[PDB]
Amino acid sequence: MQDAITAVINTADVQGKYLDDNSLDKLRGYFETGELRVRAAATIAANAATIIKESVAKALLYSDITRPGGNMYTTRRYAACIRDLDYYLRYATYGMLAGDPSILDERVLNGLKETYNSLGVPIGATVQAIQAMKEVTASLVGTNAGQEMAVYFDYICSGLS
């Protein structure tokens, strides 16, 4: 993986140059947004349980999916479902706090579309659950950090779809 800083050192390194004023402006941008990323990750760490509970309650329950023959039917499937929502929230926080979605490329979205199309996991219900976590999470962390988490949840939704 890589954060915004490592990406700057990648571009400046792969040119062979040192750090010019543009790259220093990018590092200043990250170092301005630093503290905001920290407190957002603190709040999400605090309320992960409630984000997943509220988002499952809005998006998935009392429908064909948890009715028998839906994918969510049986305890094992329900627990796997809410487990996956936990992974999306956790890696979305990693992607926010790094400032670079390369982690989502390396450790989540790799082979996930082949997995869900192999099992028969509904893509659209997954996407709507992720968007439910996006709304609830943005409600907790506020406007600016909700925009940041919004680009990483939207990155995962673009990854699955």
């Binding site: 968007q131 709304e135 943005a138 406007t143 909700g146 925009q147 940041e148 988490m149 919004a150 680009v151």
Partner: protein, 177 residues
Amino acid sequence: MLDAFSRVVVNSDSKAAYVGGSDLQSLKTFISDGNKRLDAVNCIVSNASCIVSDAISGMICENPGLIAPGGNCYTNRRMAACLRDGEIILRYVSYALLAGDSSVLDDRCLNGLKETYIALGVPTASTSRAVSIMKAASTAFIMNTASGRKIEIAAGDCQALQSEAAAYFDKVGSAVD
């Protein structure tokens, strides 16, 4: 017809939920970049007739078979409708620069055009060439790098907006071809 505002609203209605934070943050960037957009549209409103005349004159000079007999720029009337159509294309591109979304350009002008120019026998590659000349001329006026015209504005980076205008001309060009 949809602006950037109604694009965010329509996307949020596909999501079937409240606007919240992040979409409004991108729209706040639209507002803070608003005066650059205003001055850019001012740069295209003023120099348009000249740009249109030059672009179509360049289209004829690059491809002299248009002025040749039995070409679509042959008759004087056909040259008139030619110049007017270049003017109207530039007009809806300017509307797409004010709106920030290409719904006005797609709904009013773009939809129904390929089939029209095919049904008239208008050569489409020549039209896309004229759209390309209006693209380069419009980006040169929008970046204050025109030779015959250099008007003073307070300095700043506007590359985002140039890519936006080039996206609309690219869109118009794509539709014809």
